[PDB]
Write a protein that binds this ligand. Structure first.
Ligand SMILES: Nc1ncnc2c1ncn2[C@@H]1O[C@H](COP(=O)(O)OP(=O)(O)O)[C@@H](O)[C@H]1O
Ligand SMILES: Nc1ncnc2c1ncn2[C@@H]1O[C@H](COP(=O)(O)OP(=O)(O)O)[C@@H](O)[C@H]1O
Ligand SMILES: Nc1ncnc2c1ncn2[C@@H]1O[C@H](COP(=O)(O)OP(=O)(O)O)[C@@H](O)[C@H]1O
Ligand SMILES: Nc1ncnc2c1ncn2[C@@H]1O[C@H](COP(=O)(O)OP(=O)(O)O)[C@@H](O)[C@H]1O
Ligand SMILES: [Mg+2]
Ligand SMILES: [Mg+2]
Ligand SMILES: [Mg+2]
Ligand SMILES: [Mg+2]
Ligand SMILES: [Zn+2]
Ligand SMILES: [Zn+2]
Ligand SMILES: [Zn+2]
Ligand SMILES: [Zn+2]
Lengths: 421, 411, 406, 421
């Protein structure tokens, strides 16, 4: 394999991710001279996971880090390994790392890392991660919008043991991204990117770069030498949000996750809750992440986890009397877990300490289904029992959420303790 | 591979395709003077996919764009590459693009692209991909492709950088038929009794290719009788000819489709969560009730047919399919079933026959409830249903601040 | 490449190809006076492909068009161009079109066009053809006709609009057509007054024009051989054995099967008008489909009623009919009990539903079957009459059939 | 494709098939100068099917015919077309014939013709057969040891409308084949091929050529310049028949086919019966051949045909009280036919005029099975009823069969009429 011949980027070229750039500044410092860290035992991560929705500059930042450190950048895409013949995947992972070490210090980027990190190909990856010497100035960055799908072996210490969340940009972030992608473009005097930032809720960087291109097409179509405000207004429409009653439901869903995870004894600590459309900081997402601290999980831990996953839906049903599609992913994950308890873990009553999996009769298929349904239904009703018992808290957390949108650190811990002290 | 030696056409030659022509105007300007775009980095697509039924003018539009830009037009048929010996297809694609670059700007147009882009075909298609990726848009080359079989295409073909822009070419309605008849009648001697509106109205289902043939058959009728003008009777009789030569919508059928279309519109309007209805023509997160409303509306066409005609036709097949998809999704994915619980059933089926059976009863129950509700709505609003149909038959299309008001004056 | 110096033929010389003659009459009008079409923009085809087995009159037809219009005829054979030195074929095609333009209006006829219109010098030769077709002005009254019994061998470039985009199918003659062919080839011969050409048509199923001409000739040689000045019926009867199949029992059966489809189609309110029987919409409603299904089952219905035994003949129909029923039940929501639901598409539903679908499909097909049988029994006599005519002539027209259903 | 560069053979090189060579002598005469036939309207076949077990010189004779006429020979193998991508099969059939015509007169040989003649590939074959002009000196020969598997469209007149049966060789045929393959070999004086012919019952030409090679290996192994009798004796053993009580059963099976086919009204005329191990002249084989005369078949014709197919087994059961494996192929063919009556032809009581085929429920699967079983069982019991009623005839036919081995022409017709007059 042969390093990217693409155009070098820096952080100059990345808008609306000042938090991410902050954390990555050390990695740039490391790459520029690892010997400053090495000399005093400052141990950097070997793997850094970038998490966010597509088109949010995950790949961009990886490249910005390499250009900023003026180091080679290897771009691989996870979806290139799936579908490969027997062994070809692992041999490419081998080669990748052999090239990385020959060109160290360097960045190795693996896009769509979920594509490989859901056997041989991933096992080879894990051995390479642990096989290489951080001190040689090698850092592997990976991107995913599906971190819930990842093998927890990937996130073990000594691997991708740090991650950074790249969120969609708000109005101020959108404006900046507009300015970046308009730098070398000829704008009319009447163009106001502020109004365009305001009128593009939900748009990510990729969409905004596109909108800018659509705007340029509109000018060029008419043979014009400057892009007008009308061209930007018009372009938005070519590429085409949340109601205050939908905001409410989303808030109740997220609060529901939070309340149930707090009450349930083996609940996952709640560090942040958020009602940003697709922020991956929300707890709703978090609850779908693979267990990275432990290696064993107990039946009661799973039932507690399952009950937390169904908290979103429990809160909607209790409060609104009906349910939306919001909980589809929660339903799917909860079902997966229960099927796994029954068919792999030997955690059903009736089915016994047996691996079922298809290898078995309709008669067993049927008991499996009954058993899986029982677990999920029982956890769901437990969730609602909890919601109802802690309705006032649920209501309180919603109220703040509607106001603040995202609650994160020491502040969140004040609120939860006030509320469940 | 050589550019076409046939007659240069322009948009003056295309009828009833105004929306497609407006999307294509950009391409015409780019080709006239790429510098205007390249100058300000207005990135054009490399490949444009034209999608529509046969004889609707896909090839014509591709030609019109080249003619309008006064650039060479390469006319290729996907069907030529299939059946070819080992490697001959790839080598042809390679050559094809070699010539395009030597003639740039130009249009390369691949008809029947689903013939190539559905061993050897792999290599042929792989080679297509390579050439698409391999050419510089800035150099004024546009590849257009046509298909009436888009679902059969490899998604690799639709990736960004490839055929990532699609334009839909629709069958003409009354006024479009009328325009196409006028285009193909420009240079022909017509009797004073000929009325192309009436012939527009009498040829619902006809595409541009059908109408051009119609005109010629009319002409052949006059010629056979040695007459120096084409008469209305010639056109009328030509209709019956084009038919039995090689699909007209019958008047009775027109009626049924009108009621089907009026039905969707009536139900959509009554149902609280109905989708606004912008047009009727003869030619993040959702709630349970949003979905039941959607489903009920989707079943309105069939509901109208059943209530008005008693019988039901094949016309609601696509809507039944969609309605059923929605209800399986509700039962199997969203946990919106009475009895089956907040469980994901499926993902391919990983459950017992006992469950499969309950799923079927629950899907059938949802769809059947929405169906009966649709019928109640149609019976309750039969008068307005009938008024919309009457107008829709007169015009074939109702739209805009005219459909806007009709639904108010009625509801 | 000069106008053929062979005998003038007209349509009077072509037997049993009325449909194709009717398609070609406009070509003749055009050749006689192109200006009639030219002046109103009536565009004629540049290429007409005649498709059919050897000896059916493809060449004869082309010659008759020219003789009929009194216009020159250039006869070329595609098999001449195979095997040629480098370039020679293209140059011949160039010259051939140069000659047609000098002599227009005219017919240029290419026999065995598959021999050229099919991997080397043929490319060159074929490409020149495509160029010349594209190059010539139709309005000049030039028409190129081609013949093949091998149309699937043909390069589709040839069949594209502006080229050979009109195909005329030429079939083996039915009994009346064979009779006419015999008249034609007998015009100039001394026949005895005992010669019954109809009986000879009847006894010669499967014979094509070339076969029947040969037979007349063998009859003539037979009489001459015996020093006789008239050709008798015995000569023709003996000739048949010389120029040389389906059981008459099997023929009966096929005839009842076909007549059955036709009676049911006619009787059933939504059936498809019958245009022809031979023993060789956008939307569709529930009733229309049931009527169609019933009609599809008529052949078999006619066998069961008439013969009590059924043959493998209805296999395709049974398949078709079952396809329709399954689609009614599974895609069209036209079942009693199964609702306005799509079941399937492969199978996305339970065994309980699988089994209900089979009951319902079975019930529809069976009901339509019984109904077909009722129609057959009710119209037995006319069924019998139709079969009696069908067996005699091999091919009857709808108008005739509806008439018998008096 | 490019004509065989293999070594030219003549009939000189083919042993123990004097009957086959006789029939093929005309084809040689035709190929040498088709104009002698053409001139007086002598119409040759366009297709000639060679039938026999493998290793019996089917391919050999095809090549002998071409070498004898000194004409080009195209060898194709049917199994080369199956497994090919979409269209490649038909395009190769096209090309084959295009080459044949360019090199006419010539022989086109299609080995393992059953491999293609059981859609597009066979349909193309049929059009080529009917597309070519016999008078151009083109004859297509085909070989198969599975003619029961062939599409009856192949055997229609104007195609493979003549066939020749090549049987295993008896002792005298075996001796000749031994002599041919020993011509250029150095034999000891003590070698007696006669005794070797006698001791190799069941051996075909291919086996005998092999035995000869094994004999040569034994000499060469010991460094010897002549092949000894001991070497031949020894070689037989390296490559390794019927009991007089098995002969009896085979005779009763074949007689059973004959008796039932005679009695049953729509029975297939019986032209020969044989108890040669694998002669394809036997009626047992014949009854498995595809209907080549007709196009329609009636329910009663099939029931009669089914009953005849089961006559072999019926005779064994009636006479010996039990049954052997001999009837496996008959059972399989009879089942095929009944399944076809029920599922395709609309010839069941209960199932109706419906195409079943899987497209259908377990409930229907089950009725199908019941229906198919009913037909076969009813036909089987009919067969036995017939055997018992005509036991004396059955006994008589066996007796002759045991004596004569094969009964063929006018003689067979005497016997059957005496017996069922
Ligand atoms: N934060 C950002 N600031 C400026 N441009 C951005 C940003 N995010 C995305 N873009 C632009 O849009 C594209 C986003 O694609 P990518 O970097 O692959 O995002 P992701 O990896 O999240 O899918 C980039 O190529 C970049 O040009
Ligand atoms: N929209 C139209 N306006 C005018 N003529 C049309 C139109 N559509 C088709 N035609 C006539 O019929 C022909 C249709 O062929 P084509 O453009 O190949 O349609 P498609 O490519 O969609 O199959 C055209 O060449 C033209 O003569
Ligand atoms: N339909 C027909 N009517 C009269 N004669 C015919 C007919 N078809 C064939 N023949 C006779 O047989 C001869 C050979 O037929 P030909 O025209 O060469 O048929 P094709 O071109 O289909 O091979 C003709 O010249 C003609 O004399
Ligand atoms: N009748 C025979 N006479 C002489 N040799 C034979 C005979 N039959 C087969 N052989 C030899 O053994 C081989 C038999 O193979 P082959 O001709 O393919 O038979 P088949 O086509 O029946 O399988 C031949 O190559 C030939 O050398
Ligand atoms: Mg992405
Ligand atoms: Mg088209
Ligand atoms: Mg001919
Ligand atoms: Mg063999
Ligand atoms: Zn959630
Ligand atoms: Zn609809
Ligand atoms: Zn039929
Ligand atoms: Zn047997």
């Amino acid at each position: 394999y042969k390093p990217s011949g693409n155009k070098r980027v820096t952080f100059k070229d990345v808008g609306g991710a000042e938090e991410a750039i902050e954390e990555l500044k050390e990695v740039v410092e490391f790459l520029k001279d690892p010997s400053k860290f090495n000399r005093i035992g400052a141990r950097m991560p070997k793997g850094i996971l970038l998490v966010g929705p597509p088109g949010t500059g995950k790949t961009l930042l990886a490249r910005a880090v390499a250009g900023e450190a003026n180091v080679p950048f290897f771009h691989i895409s996870g979806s290139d390994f799936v579908e490969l013949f027997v062994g070809v995947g692992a041999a490419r992972v081998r080669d990748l790392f052999a090239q990385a070490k020959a060109h160290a210090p360097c960045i190795v980027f693996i896009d769509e890392i979920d594509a490989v990190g859901r056997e041989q190909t991933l096992n080879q990856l894990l051995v390479e991660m642990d096989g290489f010497d951080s001190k040689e100035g090698i850092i592997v960055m990976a991107a995913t919008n599906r971190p819930d799908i990842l093998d927890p072996a990937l996130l073990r210490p000594g691997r991708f043991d740090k991650k950074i969340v790249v969120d969609p940009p708000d109005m101020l972030g959108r404006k900046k991204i507009l300015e970046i992608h308009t730098r070398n473009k000829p704008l009319a005097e009447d163009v106001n990117l502020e109004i365009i930032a305001k009128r593009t809720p939900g748009f990510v960087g990729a969409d905004l770069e596109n909108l800018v291109n659509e705007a340029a097409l509109l000018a060029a179509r008419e043979g014009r030498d400057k892009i007008t405000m009308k061209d930007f207004e018009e372009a938005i429409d070519r590429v085409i949000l949340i109601s205050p009653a939908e905001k409410r439901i989303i808030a109740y869903h997220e609060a529901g996750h939070a309340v149930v995870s707090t009450v349930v004894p083996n609940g996952e600590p709640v560090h942040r809750i958020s009602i940003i459309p697709r922020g991956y900081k929300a707890l709703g997402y978090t609850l779908h992440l693979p267990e990275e601290d432990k290696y064993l999980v107990s039946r009661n831990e799973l039932l507690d986890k399952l009950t937390a996953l169904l908290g979103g839906r429990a809160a909607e049903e209790v409060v609104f009397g009906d349910v939306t599609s919001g909980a589809a992913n929660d339903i799917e994950r909860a079902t997966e877990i229960a099927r796994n308890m029954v068919c792999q873990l030997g955690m059903s009553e009736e089915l016994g300490p047996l691996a079922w999996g298809r290898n078995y009769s309709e008669e067993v298929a049927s008991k499996i289904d009954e058993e899986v349904k029982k677990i999920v239904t029982n956890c769901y009703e437990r969730a609602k029992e909890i919601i109802r018992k802690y309705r006032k808290q649920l209501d309180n957390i919603v109220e703040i959420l509607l106001e603040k949108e995202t609650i994160e650190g020491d502040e969140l811990r004040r609120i939860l303790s006030e509320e469940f002290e």
